[PDB]
Design a protein around this ligand. Structure first.
Ligand SMILES: NC(=O)c1cc([N+](=O)[O-])c(Cl)cc1NCc1cccnc1
Length: 294
């Protein structure tokens, strides 16, 4: 509208273009996401509206949802940087462990909150984690995926990142559980630690096989029901699980232990956000100040 004064284009979000904008009235600086269509699902409107009440310090606040002219505008509290940029910027030195730990702990608090409220993220990735100068990190775009089917190609037909997708999703499971978010977060945790994506698949099958090559091809022993999953094929090659100390060196045993529980194949054995918060890895957690250059 005209209530907002566009400051600049932030990018081509998962659904549409994103602008940093200023409310000409409140002077508030926000992120404005314009979403793509034959009137936009009124069901999505109701659902999205619900997300406005989902308030937590580690969840990017959804200030407003405006449906007009077949266009859907989402107004979010604004944060200056995402974790992908931060990780790229810290690539040479690595994010100090205390900060990695603080971020993981805050992200789990955010997930525990969303999950206790029956809200799933479904598409967690570094890009969707925003940080500020105070050392806070927040989950962005939480319950959107459920209010808009499944991803494939953004407006500019950009390639959908499969790197953080849980295996049950890749094996065609129809009902996501809170476990898919823990999986993505485990992938992100590993990436902050090693400074390299854990499973950088460039196709759905390559994603699945990269997971299999590292964690071992799942079977009925470690994942009851896996062989009956929609896209499971008996012809999948059978790779032996790799030693976990080789996956995220030089992370300590507390860290490797937590990660392994976040990466259990069986969604039901995978650790919950709540339980993960109690893991010994967080015994000495603190809240460091990141070195952000805005
Ligand atoms: N809530 C937000 O602040 C925000 C929202 C969206 N988005 O609605 O999709 C996106 Cl892309 C980025 C954001 N900020 C990070 C940022 C800020 C300035 C420049 N580059 C990145």
């Amino acid at each position: 509208m005209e209530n907002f004064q566009k400051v600049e284009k932030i990018g081509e979000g998962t659904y549409g273009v994103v602008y940093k904008a200023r409310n000409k009235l409140t002077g508030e600086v926000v992120a404005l996401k314009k979403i793509r269509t034959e009137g936009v699902p009124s069901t999505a409107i109701r659902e999205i509206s619900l997300l406005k009440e989902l308030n937590h310090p580690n969840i990017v606040k959804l200030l407003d949802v405006i449906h007009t002219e077949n266009k859907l505008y989402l107004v979010f509290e604004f944060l200056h940087q995402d974790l992908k940029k931060f990780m790229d910027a810290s690539a040479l030195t690595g994010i100090p462990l205390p900060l990695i730990k603080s971020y993981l702990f805050q992200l789990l608090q955010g997930l525990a909150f969303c999950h206790s409220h029956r809200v799933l993220h479904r598409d967690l990735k570094p890009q969707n984690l925003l940080i500020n100068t105070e050392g806070a990190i927040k989950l962005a775009d939480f319950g959107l995926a459920r209010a808009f089917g499944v991803p494939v190609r953004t407006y500019t037909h950009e390639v959908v990142t499969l790197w953080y997708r849980a295996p049950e999703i890749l094996l065609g499971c129809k009902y996501y559980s809170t476990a898919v978010d823990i999986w993505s977060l485990g992938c992100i945790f590993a990436e902050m630690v090693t400074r390299r994506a854990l499973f950088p698949g460039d196709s759905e099958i390559d994603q699945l096989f990269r997971i299999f090559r590292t964690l071992g091809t799942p079977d009925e022993v470690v994942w009851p029901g896996v062989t009956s999953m929609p896209d499971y094929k008996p012809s999948f090659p059978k790779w032996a699980r790799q030693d976990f100390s080789k996956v995220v060196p030089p992370l300590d045993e507390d860290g490797r232990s937590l990660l392994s529980q976040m990466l259990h194949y069986d969604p039901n054995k995978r650790i919950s956000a709540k339980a993960a918060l109690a893991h010994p890895f967080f015994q000495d957690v603190t809240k460091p100040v990141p070195h952000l250059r805005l």
